[PDB]
Design a protein around this nucleic acid. Structure first.
Ligand SMILES: Nc1ncnc2c1ncn2[C@@H]1O[C@@H]2COP(=O)(O)O[C@H]2[C@H]1O
Ligand SMILES: Nc1ncnc2c1ncn2[C@@H]1O[C@@H]2COP(=O)(O)O[C@H]2[C@H]1O
Lengths: 200, 200
DNA sequence: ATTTCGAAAAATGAGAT
DNA sequence: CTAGATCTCATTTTTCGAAAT
DNA sequence: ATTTCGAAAAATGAGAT
DNA sequence: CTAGATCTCATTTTTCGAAAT
C-alpha cells in the first residue's frame, strides 16, 4: 500500500536471530519497531523468572509502541524472536514527525493497539471465567488463527509444545498434557508430539 | 485547552444516571464517548452472568473507541455508570472527519489506549503470578488511589463490597471476606461494612 | 443538597463439602 | 497436597423513595 | 556452504501427595 | 469438596553442531 512504503523508507531495518531478545522490561523506550519478516513472542515474567506469553506478533505488526505517548516510559514486556526476524527501527522522536506530515500512519498503529486491547481483554476474561480446559480449547482456536499455522483437511495444523501452551494459559506442562489427551479422546484434536491438529 | 473544546463543540452531550448502562457488549459500534464528568465501570460477562471488572474509567477518559478502527465491529464490553455522568458522544464517521482536520485528537486517544494496554497486561500478570491475598492487597492500594477515594485521618478510605472486589481480582465473595479479616488482623486495614480504611 | 425513616434489596459469614 | 470454590440460610448492611431542612 | 546424523537436551508420560 | 500444582523418575522427541558430501 501507499504510506507504509514511505514509512519503512525512514526506518533503519535490522536483523535478529531467532530466540534473541528485541526488547527488555524496565528498559527506557525511544524506539518503535516494525516487523517486516518473522515473528516474535511478547512475554512477561514473575519475580522467580517464570514466564507467561502475552501474545504473538507476526509480520506487518508494530513493536514497542507503548512508550510512545508519555515521557519516561519503560518497556512493559520482553519481546523475543521466535523465528529469524527482519525488523525496521525508528526513534520515537522521528516517528512522531512522520505523523505530522501524514497522520494516516498513526491510524494504522492505533488500529493495532485497539485490536491488542480487545484480545488482551478477552484474555483476562478467560483467565477468570474459564478453567484450564476452557482456556486451552480457546488458545488452541487462537493458534489456528496464526499465520504460521498450516492447513489440514481435518482442519488446521499447528506446531507447538505442551510446555509453551502452559506458558500461554498459565498452568503446568502436566496439566496441559493431561488435558491434551482428554481432547484427543473426543476426536476434537489430533496430537502427536510437537504437532497439534485442531479438527475444525 | 482548544483541541478539546473544539472537540466537544462537535459532540452531542448526554447524561446518564448512576448505575445506568451506556454501552451494551455485542452491539454494533458507530459511536465514541468522552467522560466530561463522573465515572464508569468497564465490565464483561460470561454465559452464566458472572461479571468481571476490566477497568474503571473517569473524567477525561475516552469510551467506545475500540470499534472505531475496523468496519463491522461489536462493543467489546459493557460500560455502566458508577456515579451520575455527563458524557460527550460523537459518531465514528463524524470523528473520522475531525481526525483529519487535527490528528492531535487521535494522538490523544491513542495515548489512552496505550495506557489501558499496559494496565490490562499488568492484570494478566497479577492473575497468573499472584495469590488472592496479593491481588486483593494490590487492589485496595489501587482503589485507594482512584480519584473518588476519601481522605482519612489514618490513610485513604473507600466504599466497595466484597462482591465487587472479587470481580476485579477474580475470586468469590467468600474468599474476599476471609482474606479481608486477615488483612485487618495484621493492622493493615480496618473494615467496617462496605467502608474500608487503607492505613497510610 | 441532604439527614431522616421505613421498607425492600443486597451483601455477608459460617462451616460443611 | 492444598489454595479456593460452592452451597445455604440466618443476619447484617445498604440502598431507595418520599419529606423536611 | 548446505546437508546427514547420533548424542545431549528438552519435552513428556506416569503415578503419588 | 476438587481442579491443578508439585515432585520424582523413566521414557520419547528435538535440537544441534561435528562431519560429511
Ligand atoms: N498485551 C500485549 N499484546 C501485544 N503486544 C504487547 C502487549 N503488551 C505489550 N506488548 C508489546 O510489548 C512491548 C514492550 O515494550 P513497550 O511497552 O515499549 O511496547 C510493548 C508492546 O509493543
Ligand atoms: N481492558 C479495557 N480497559 C479499559 N477500557 C476497556 C477495556 N476493554 C474495553 N474497554 C472499553 O469498553 C468499550 C466496549 O466497547 P468498545 O469496543 O466500543 O470500546 C471499549 C472501550 O471503550
Amino acid at each position: 500500500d501507499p504510506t507504509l512504503e514511505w514509512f519503512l523508507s525512514h526506518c533503519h531495518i535490522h536483523k535478529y536471530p531467532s530466540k534473541s531478545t528485541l526488547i527488555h522490561q524496565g528498559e527506557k523506550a525511544e524506539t518503535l519497531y516494525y516487523i517486516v519478516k518473522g515473528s516474535v513472542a511478547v512475554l512477561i515474567k514473575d519475580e522467580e523468572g517464570k514466564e507467561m506469553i502475552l501474545s504473538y506478533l507476526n509480520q506487518g505488526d508494530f513493536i514497542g509502541e507503548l512508550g510512545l505517548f508519555e515521557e519516561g516510559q519503560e518497556r512493559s514486556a520482553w519481546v523475543r524472536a521466535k523465528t529469524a526476524c527482519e525488523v525496521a527501527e525508528i526513534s520515537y522522536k522521528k516517528f512522531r514527525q512522520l505523523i505530522q506530515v501524514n497522520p494516516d500512519i498513526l491510524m494504522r498503529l492505533s488500529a493495532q493497539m485497539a485490536r491488542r486491547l480487545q484480545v488482551t481483554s478477552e484474555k483476562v476474561g478467560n483467565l477468570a471465567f474459564l478453567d484450564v480446559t476452557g482456556r486451552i480449547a480457546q488458545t488452541l482456536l487462537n493458534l489456528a488463527k496464526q499465520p504460521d499455522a498450516m492447513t489440514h483437511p481435518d482442519g488446521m495444523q499447528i506446531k507447538i509444545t505442551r510446555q509453551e501452551i502452559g506458558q500461554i494459559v498459565g498452568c503446568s506442562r502436566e496439566t496441559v498434557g493431561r488435558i491434551l489427551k482428554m481432547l484427543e479422546d473426543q476426536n476434537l484434536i489430533s496430537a502427536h508430539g510437537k504437532t497439534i491438529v485442531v479438527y475444525g
